[PDB]
């Protein structure tokens, strides 16, 4: 019969032939997103499982080069700014340029952003655009609300185009921010490309801050940690960061 490789029926397909307990297989198949219980042809994967693998790869490769529309960020009321990177092609090959704000970038933040905030929220596409557009409206409003109800001096958000994680150190120095929160898209997986991550550092400094000084919250999407549920833990994290005056491995517990 006809079958779409991207369909839910295909994703729940069981290819084990003559199984010991097929009821357990269905139990295991719904227990994980991993491509389990697809069977085998000798020691090789089965045809359909391979076909669904190659289909997802064609979709996953397209998410790499796609960019968030300049109109979408404007519709979110966000200030768009970019690193030294000009285009996506150069973004994949030059990580050092994605870690520095461009000349017009430094001056825009010093003009349109709140000086010396206690919590600064930065958002960048990173390596996944879907991780932004899909989860933004779900995580960001409760994030800003929790940091203000009842909170402190919150900087204004701004979108960083073609940005890497280390660029949040420059944003902390420029804006004098106490805590910089970066929501950035991770590299695209095979099955999904909606995975968002959070990198937070206390009072960053480009010269001394090592990578271990950041706290990481990964797999923020519908298939992992819910964005609204994630929004609350980032809020609490920002609290504890300001009380302890430390981040990453430097925090207790």
């Amino acid at each position: 019969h006809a079958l779409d490789l991207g369909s839910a029926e295909a994703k729940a397909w069981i290819g084990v032939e003559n199984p010991h307990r097929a009821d357990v297989l269905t139990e295991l198949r719904r227990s994980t997103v991993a491509r389990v219980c697809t069977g085998r042809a000798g020691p090789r994967p089965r045809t359909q499982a391979l076909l669904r693998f190659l289909a997802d790869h064609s979709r996953s490769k397209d998410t790499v080069l796609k960019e968030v529309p300049e109109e979408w960020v404007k519709a979110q009321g966000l200030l768009e700014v970019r690193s030294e990177i000009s285009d996506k092609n150069l973004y994949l090959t030059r990580p050092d340029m994605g870690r520095r704000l461009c000349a017009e970038a430094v001056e825009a933040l010093k003009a349109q952003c709140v000086a010396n905030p206690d919590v600064q929220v930065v958002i960048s596409d990173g390596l996944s655009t879907d991780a932004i557009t899909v989860n933004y409206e779900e995580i960001l409003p409760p994030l800003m609300a929790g940091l203000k109800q009842a909170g402190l001096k919150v900087g204004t958000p701004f979108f960083v185009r073609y940005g890497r994680v280390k660029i949040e150190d420059q944003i902390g120095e420029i804006l004098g921010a106490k805590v910089v929160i970066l929501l950035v898209g991770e590299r695209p997986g095979l099955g999904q490309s909606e995975s968002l991550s959070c990198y937070a550092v206390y009072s960053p400094r480009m010269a001394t801050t090592v990578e271990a000084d950041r706290t990481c919250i990964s797999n923020i999407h519908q298939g992992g940690t819910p964005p609204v549920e994630a929004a609350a833990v980032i809020v609490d994290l920002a609290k504890r960061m300001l009380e302890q005056k430390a981040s990453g491995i430097n925090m207790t517990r």
Binding site: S31, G39, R187
Partner: protein, 453 residues
Amino acid sequence: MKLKTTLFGNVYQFKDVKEVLAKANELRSGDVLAGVAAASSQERVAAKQVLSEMTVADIRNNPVIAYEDDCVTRLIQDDVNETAYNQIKNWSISELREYVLSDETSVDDIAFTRKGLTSEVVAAVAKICSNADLIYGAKKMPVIKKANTTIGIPGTFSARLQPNDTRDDVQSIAAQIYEGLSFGVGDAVIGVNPVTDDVENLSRVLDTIYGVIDKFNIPTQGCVLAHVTTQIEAIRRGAPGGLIFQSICGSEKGLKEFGVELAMLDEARAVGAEFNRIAGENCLYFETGQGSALSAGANFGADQVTMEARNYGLARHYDPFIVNTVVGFIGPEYLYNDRQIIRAGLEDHFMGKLSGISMGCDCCYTNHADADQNLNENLMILLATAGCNYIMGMPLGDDIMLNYQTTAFHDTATVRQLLNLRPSPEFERWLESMGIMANGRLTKRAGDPSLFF
């Protein structure tokens, strides 16, 4: 030492050893990003010749990072056997390459000769080796370690069960474990990359891993690839200790980027000796991969191949049970396509085996790189012929959490039956008892996770 040579009437002059080591590398996107790559094929060949004519002493006395400035350089230099070094200090890199490749050089000859090498010398040999040189040379340099399984015996091929999950769900992790055990994967380790880096989450993952181990009396070991400090804390508090893992970098600055002190690895060795459920004497696990030092801005003008060798020189000091490069884990900015990921995978494995560590490889790629799953199947077979100690295993190689593709459970069983390789002998006996494997081949009832219920 000479830093120049004439090629086709044109003179090719180089600044120091560090530039010679870099321009001798095969073309890769990482050396270009670092600004140390050769400008053409001609300059690359000229750098190889100048390198091949340099002696072991020329490279041993010129580490990419100075002794008094870097604790990894000191560790490498301090562990050198000076008697083995003085025997080969005047050997050119060309003669050391031919010495390693010689059929008249036995495994016991290399056992003493490698003690006189430094990582820079190990990297030097790999740079003037072809792909087949890297494969055949590594095959004749087996490295055997023992935990609850023996790994690295010629004729055997192991695999790490990697059951990762987007939320560290113990139902998702256990489901991937039964799937991998049904293909004969897990004799290297059952290792989980944890989403959250907290003690209580680690103990839950370890209890799930060892709950399966204790139920079927599996000869293997569990591990959660969190930071080494949190692993130490969990095991001290009563978590089942098997292998202790840490990611390593080839420079002190790179280790500080990961938040790693050398005392932590010393503590990991001491914690394993007091708490870990290991029969053998090897209980540590390290992962490497070209591009980590450059990513941390800690390469100090050195190429990623030379810096990767320094990882192996670091790891050898702690005699771990397993080390594997994660060859294509990062992205195209360090290794762009199939050609470069394969070449780096062969170099890494060769350098690891020449350093005397239980060298495996995570044959893998990312979706923003110019690669597909056929690359993983090409490299996993070449490295198997090279005697690679182990690869990874995931359902179809799809990591739902780390967002990359590694090798499948099918792939280990494929390699074993294609090349007539067996698992670790302890693990092979267990699979035979479970009816999963007979004469190294999957039985008819294999590949079925419902067999464990």
